[PDB]
Amino acid sequence: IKLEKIEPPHYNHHWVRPLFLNYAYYLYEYRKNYYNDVIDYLNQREKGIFREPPRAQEWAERAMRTYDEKNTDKSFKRSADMKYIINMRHEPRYYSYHTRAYYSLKYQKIL
């Protein structure tokens, strides 16, 4: 059996330098999403309080929920975004003026 053809194998790095890198920064925050929300609802319901059964969730909505969980700064200035439409004024306006007293002990008699 002749006429063997080979391709360059491996190309393993000869000057060592393999290095390593941890990856828990993103995997944990994304893996945790599927299981926690369900289980965090399963056990919390087991605690004795009810809410909506687990709906199937789409990636963007799950990311939004994780973002809401992460932002510990539960900004009260969303209520500021609303008081852009609020801060109502002049509801207790008067436009009526005072009555004074045009009295000099007038007598209408009878009564």
Kindly state whether residue 87 falls inside one of the protein's structural domains: no
Kindly state whether residue 49 falls inside one of the protein's structural domains: yes
Give the count of domains, the chain: 1
Could you tell me if 73 and 56 are in contact, meaning their C-beta atoms sit under 8 angstroms apart?
A: no
Dihedral over Cα of 34, 37, 39, 41: its sign: negative
- Six-digit token pair at 57? 């969730």
Of the candidates 34, 64, 70, 72, the one whose C-alpha atom is nearest the C-alpha of residue 42 is 34
Kindly state whether residue 107 falls inside one of the protein's structural domains: no
108: Cα within 13 Å, side-chain hemisphere: 2
- Six-digit token pair at 61? 């909505």
Give 109's DSSP letter: -
The C-alpha atoms of residue 39 and residue 45 are separated, in whole angstroms, by 9
Kindly state whether residue 30 falls inside one of the protein's structural domains: yes
Kindly state whether residue 57 falls inside one of the protein's structural domains: yes
Q: Which helix (H) or strand (E) holds 43?
A: helix 24-47
Which structural technique was applied? cryo-EM
The domain containing residue 58 runs over which residues? 24-70
